[PDB]
Structures are given as structure tokens and as C-alpha cells.
């Protein structure tokens, strides 16, 4: 039963860390997207600004 | 784009308004030249009729 619960531990940690690392690639892509939205906001609020300027 | 095409439209209206107010003074001044020469010949013919009124 030692090695039985051992195998349970193995499969559990394995699936749990696969989930952790898919959440990790999720955080990679969402930080990317966050900087993307940041520069988006910058440049598009800026074209709004120059729109008001020339308006 | 609203401000843009609006100013462009009214600028075309201004350029045509200039293209007409230019010769506005032209067809004004030709009228005055006419007035002048007509009054002149008026005086001439009034003198000539009177000179011929003799007998």
C-alpha cells in the first residue's frame, strides 16, 4: 500500500503540474495580450488625441 | 473625418466664392466706365442740339 499511494501521488502531482503549466502558458499569453492592449490604448487614444487636435 | 470633410467642403465653397467675388468688382467697374462715357456723350449731344437750336 506504500507504493500504491506512491503511484497515486505520482499521477496526482503529474496531472496537477500539467494543469499548473497550462495555466503558466496562459499567463505568458495573457501578459503578452496585456502589453498589447496597453500599446493599443496608447496609440488609439493618441489618434483620438490628434483627432481632437485637428478637429 | 467629420471635421475633415466639413472643412474641405466649406473650403471649396470659399474658393468658388472667391472665384466669383473676384470679378464681382470687375462687372462693378465696367458699369462705372459705362456711366462715365455715357454722361460724357450726354453732355456732348446736349451741347450739339443746343448749338443747332439756333434759328
From Swiss-Prot, chain A:
Modified residues (Phosphothreonine): 8
Family: Belongs to the tropomyosin family.
Positions of region (Disordered): 17-36
Subunit relationships: Homodimer. Heterodimer of an alpha (TPM1, TPM3 or TPM4) and a beta (TPM2) chain.
Function as written in the Swiss-Prot or TrEMBL entry: Binds to actin filaments in muscle and non-muscle cells. Plays a central role, in association with the troponin complex, in the calcium dependent regulation of vertebrate striated muscle contraction. Smooth muscle contraction is regulated by interaction with caldesmon. In non-muscle cells is implicated in stabilizing cytoskeleton actin filaments. The non-muscle isoform may have a role in agonist-mediated receptor internalization.
Gene, per the UniProt record: Tpm2
Intracellular or extracellular location(s): Cytoplasm, Cytoskeleton
Name of the protein: Tropomyosin beta chain
Entry domain remark: The molecule is in a coiled coil structure that is formed by 2 polypeptide chains. The sequence exhibits a prominent seven-residues periodicity.
Amino acid at each position: 500500500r506504500a507504493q500504491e499511494r506512491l503511484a497515486t501521488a505520482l499521477q496526482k502531482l503529474e496531472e496537477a503540474e500539467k494543469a499548473a503549466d497550462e495555466s503558466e502558458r496562459g499567463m505568458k499569453v495573457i501578459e503578452n495580450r496585456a502589453m498589447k492592449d496597453e500599446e493599443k490604448m496608447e496609440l488609439q487614444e493618441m489618434q483620438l488625441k490628434e483627432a481632437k487636435h485637428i478637429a | 473625418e467629420d471635421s475633415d470633410r466639413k472643412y474641405e467642403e466649406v473650403a471649396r465653397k470659399l474658393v468658388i466664392l472667391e472665384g466669383e467675388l473676384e470679378r464681382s468688382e470687375e462687372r462693378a467697374e465696367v458699369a462705372e466706365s459705362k456711366c462715365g462715357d455715357l454722361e460724357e456723350e450726354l453732355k456732348i449731344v446736349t451741347n450739339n442740339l443746343k448749338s443747332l437750336e439756333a434759328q
